[PDB]
Design a protein around this ligand. Structure first.
Ligand SMILES: [Zn+2]
Lengths: 457, 439
């Protein structure tokens, strides 16, 4: 807003244009589209990923080879990625190259050709990618977590495309998706280190005459349901140890919710990680999950707090990996930690805990923001979501003013299943795990035994 | 606008770059030291110190340093290279001074408790066994050993197991006493940093550091230039699935006038991976040959390593121990170097290389941490910091001719050293390589 040197305006076609910071050694820019796996429904499953893998191929006014070569000559520092709520084209380039990069981006965003050959390539390649993804627990568990938390809808619609659905992703469906989401009114052009005036010139020049297709509005609010699921134990390799995994969460908060900073502090206060944790002081070894779990139980090789926060909902909870032998204890170990954040009169959150968590949160946010690309992405998404960029000062203040009771209040709200988001979610826990199901015991009974969750509407 | 510099009475240099609109920063103390300051019996000490620096000082016990950094959200880290010893911190701007304090405390007032010194011996050994599983690291450590035969640069950073077991608290304090001089160190900062205040704090917390009795400016010749020794070391290991080869020739030092030209030439040859390709829209003739008729190898990687007074430039190759005749891929690499020497390279590939280099050197200077890294290393090994704009200029002016010249000087009638690990039976000789290369 102010020290940011943040400026925002719109083109006649609704395209928002956001700039921030001052001149520097180089610049960053990107096009942000309010699209993602949560909007695919069942009909466009996997379209978001294929379009992003199709980014920067041939366009109406630029041959494929030329596109590739010009992007190399620009430094090659660009990318298109997408997730559940985002689809973005970003790059950092030298100052004199902003216009050329914006042109290439707008070409692939407005006039992609999507030839049979380019599509067939990305599809063939997507199958291999999916096969590999399913072997990585750090990617699979969170996928199972979301799917079960929303019963396979919106935020729980598969982020990893079902392998068998890839071959039926046709140009027709890709065009249908583009005609629904690639519209100026659903897009943001952001720039770091580029004067607002220049940005408006370049934007109007390349995106100004872009027109909406006025598609049917298809954006459903996320409805948290909670749920359970378990997949078979992973294959046992060589010297690598066998581990079971479990993730337990409850509906969290929207990224702009008033208690979001409190919640992020809770997450930092719990912290956690892998029993190895490489790095010098400051890594967060005095977080509760390290202290009360990692240091106490080593049949536990990993324990960490997660906080997935989206536009209209979120999932907050704890992740735990352990030896098959300890599986029977997982649920309770996790339940105890959640309980100890608010319902244990003798393990209340201390001034020291909260003060440290607070500072570490301020720290990681501000330090991550040292990168232009990060300032860029954060700005683009914020504007895409509520058309405004929260100033740093405000963010810091809201965190510095947090007090233990704030953190305790939020902990209770979350673990009690008492969050009331627009989707009006159930207070049921989400429990997802990999290993022999039996090995985890009566999961719901242990959670109830601890007063976690909510059973009556 | 740019990098501010100040020198302290004891010789310590303070280099800084303010980053507008930031509330955090990075401060690091860089010391001209590392493993190259050790001797055969000394070898491994600098790294040992690195580990003990977090174990306790005359002012803060171990858990006191940890808890203090974590309560304010800072981060403490360190590393040892063949050339330097570096400790650095990341923290909110409010904590810069506390940062400088701790850094000085850790570097100069470390307890070096005898109990700690013994418990650590095992940790270093474990670390050593882990590197033994990183074949690229093994090959390059051996390459340094034969190329810089019986010289400082030829020793590894961890040191021999023998030494890891015999290093004494005396060795440690001796290394500290001998090397930690103000004229041999740089306090670098970037982000929300006031150059003036940081100089004061430097004086306050680092002023007590001894001056050398024979001060030399940071970028001046340590002494006799390292000498590149031609040689070869075949390390037969038939159990390995992949074979690893590094071929090098004398390279360029940090301050060499042709430094960027050397990097440009490295980028022109580039890299390749049997599965991924080149990371380029259009592959060089080498990459094409490598991928043809079944593949000649699993991957190759051009490299250029620099030191204040020397450098190594070459190719790292990984082949399938059972499927590849190493000789065939080496032939192609030499052919590619000869293509450059013969001038048969397009304006396009030169421009592509310069663009890649500029990006790699400049777009990567993003956070305060990467910037401090560049400030510190440049000043501590060179005596100055070329600015991003100066670097851009140095690369932008490179010509096809500069490159052809550089290859003809460095890759014609010059000595080469080589190291190979794995199925050594198919690996060609060093004189074989020179013959084909100079041919
Ligand atoms: Zn180490």
């Amino acid at each position: 807003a102010r020290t940011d040197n943040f400026k925002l305006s719109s083109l006649a076609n609704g395209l928002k244009v956001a700039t921030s910071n001052t001149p520097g050694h180089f610049s960053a820019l990107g096009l942000y589209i309010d699209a993602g796996s949560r909007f695919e429904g069942r009909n466009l499953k996997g379209c978001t990923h294929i379009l992003d893998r199709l980014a920067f191929k041939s366009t109406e006014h630029v041959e494929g080879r030329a596109m590739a070569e010009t992007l190399e000559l620009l430094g090659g520092n660009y990318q298109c990625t997408s997730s559940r709520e985002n689809l973005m084209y970003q790059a950092s380039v030298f100052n004199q190259d902003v216009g050329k990069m914006l042109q290439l981006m707008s070409e692939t965003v407005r006039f992609p050709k999507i030839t049979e050959q380019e599509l067939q390539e990305q599809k063939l390649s997507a199958e291999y990618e999916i096969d590999e993804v399913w072997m990585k627990p750090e990617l699979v568990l969170p996928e199972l977590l979301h799917t079960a938390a929303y019963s396979g809808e919106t935020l729980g619609s598969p982020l990893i495309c079902p392998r068998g659905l890839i071959p039926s992703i046709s140009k027709y469906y890709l065009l249908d998706y583009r005609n629904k989401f690639y519209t100026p009114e659903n897009t943001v052009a952001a720039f770091v280190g580029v004067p607002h005036e220049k940005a408006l010139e370049l934007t109007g020049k390349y995106l100004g005459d872009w027109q909406s297709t006025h598609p049917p509005i298809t954006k459903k609010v996320a409805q948290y349901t909670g749920g359970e699921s378990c997949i078979p134990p992973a294959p046992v390799f060589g010297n690598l140890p066998e581990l079971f995994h479990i993730q337990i969460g409850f509906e969290g908060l929207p990224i702009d919710h008033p208690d979001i900073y409190a919640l992020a502090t809770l997450q930092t206060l719990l912290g956690g990680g892998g029993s190895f944790s490489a790095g010098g002081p400051g890594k967060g070894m005095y977080s509760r999950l390290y202290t009360h779990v990692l240091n106490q139980y080593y049949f536990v090789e990993n324990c960490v707090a997660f906080n997935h926060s989206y536009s209209d909902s979120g999932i907050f909870g704890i992740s735990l990996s352990c030896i098959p032998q300890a599986a029977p204890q997982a649920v309770e170990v996790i339940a105890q930690q959640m309980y100890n954040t608010f319902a244990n009169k003798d393990l209340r959150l201390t001034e020291d805990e909260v003060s440290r968590a607070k500072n570490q949160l301020k720290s990681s946010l501000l330090m991550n923001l040292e990168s232009k690309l990060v300032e860029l992405e954060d700005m683009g998404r914020q504007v895409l979501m509520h058309g405004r960029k929260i100033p740093v000062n405000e963010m810091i203040s809201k965190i510095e003013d947090l007090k233990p009771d704030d953190i305790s209040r939020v902990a209770e709200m979350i673990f009690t299943g008492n969050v009331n988001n627009a989707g009006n979610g159930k207070g049921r826990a989400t429990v997802v795990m990999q290993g022999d199901r039996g090995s985890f015991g009566d999961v719901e009974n242990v959670l109830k035994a601890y007063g976690l969750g909510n059973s009556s509407s | 606008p740019g990098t501010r510099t100040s020198k302290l009475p004891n010789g310590l240099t303070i280099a800084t770059e303010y980053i507008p609109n930031t509330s955090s920063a990075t401060v690091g103390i860089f010391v001209d030291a590392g493993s190259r300051a050790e001797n055969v019996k000394n070898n491994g000490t600098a790294h040992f110190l690195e580990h003990l620096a977090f174990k306790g000082t005359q002012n803060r016990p171990q858990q006191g340093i940890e808890l203090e950094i974590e309560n304010i959200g800072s981060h403490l880290n360190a590393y040892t290279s063949r050339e330097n010893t570096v400790y650095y911190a990341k923290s909110l701007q409010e904590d810069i001074p506390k940062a400088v304090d701790i850094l000085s405390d850790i570097l100069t007032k470390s307890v070096l408790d005898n109990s700690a010194i013994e418990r650590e011996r095992d940790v270093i050994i474990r670390e050593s066994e882990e590197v033994d599983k990183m074949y690229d690291e093994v090959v390059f450590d051996h390459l340094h050993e034969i190329t810089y035969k019986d010289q400082p640069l030829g020793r590894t950073i961890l040191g021999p197991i023998k030494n890891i077991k015999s290093i004494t608290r005396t060795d440690l304090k001796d290394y500290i006493t001998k090397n930690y001089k103000g004229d041999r160190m740089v306090l670098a900062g970037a982000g929300a940093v006031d150059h003036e205040k940081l100089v004061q704090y430097a004086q306050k917390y680092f002023g007590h550091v001894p001056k050398s009795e024979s001060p030399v400016p940071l970028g001046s010749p340590r002494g006799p230039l390292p000498v590149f020794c031609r040689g070869e070391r075949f390390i037969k290991e038939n159990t390995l699935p992949t074979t690893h080869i590094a071929i090098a020739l004398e390279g360029v030092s940090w301050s060499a006038p042709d430094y960027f030209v050397a990097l440009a030439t490295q980028a022109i040859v580039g890299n390749w991976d049997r599965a991924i390709g080149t990371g380029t829209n259009s592959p060089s003739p080498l990459a094409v040959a490598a991928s043809q008729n079944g593949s000649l190898a699993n991957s190759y990687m051009s490299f250029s390593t620099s030191y204040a007074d020397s450098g190594l430039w070459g190719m790292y190759i990984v082949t399938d121990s059972n499927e590849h005749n190493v000789r065939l891929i080496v032939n192609e690499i030499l052919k590619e170097w000869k293509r450059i020497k013969s001038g048969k390279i397009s304006d396009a590939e030169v421009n592509r290389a310069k663009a890649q280099l500029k990006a790699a050197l400049l777009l990567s200077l993003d956070g305060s941490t990467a910037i401090v890294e560049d400030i510190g290393r440049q000043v501590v090994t060179t005596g100055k910091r070329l600015s991003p704009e100066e670097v851009f200029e140095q690369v932008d002016k490179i010509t096809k001719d500069d490159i052809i010249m550089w290859a003809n000087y460095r890759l014609q009638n010059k000595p080469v050293s080589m190291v190979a690990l794995g199925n050594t039976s198919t690996v060609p000789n060093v004189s074989y390589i020179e013959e084909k290369l100079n041919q």
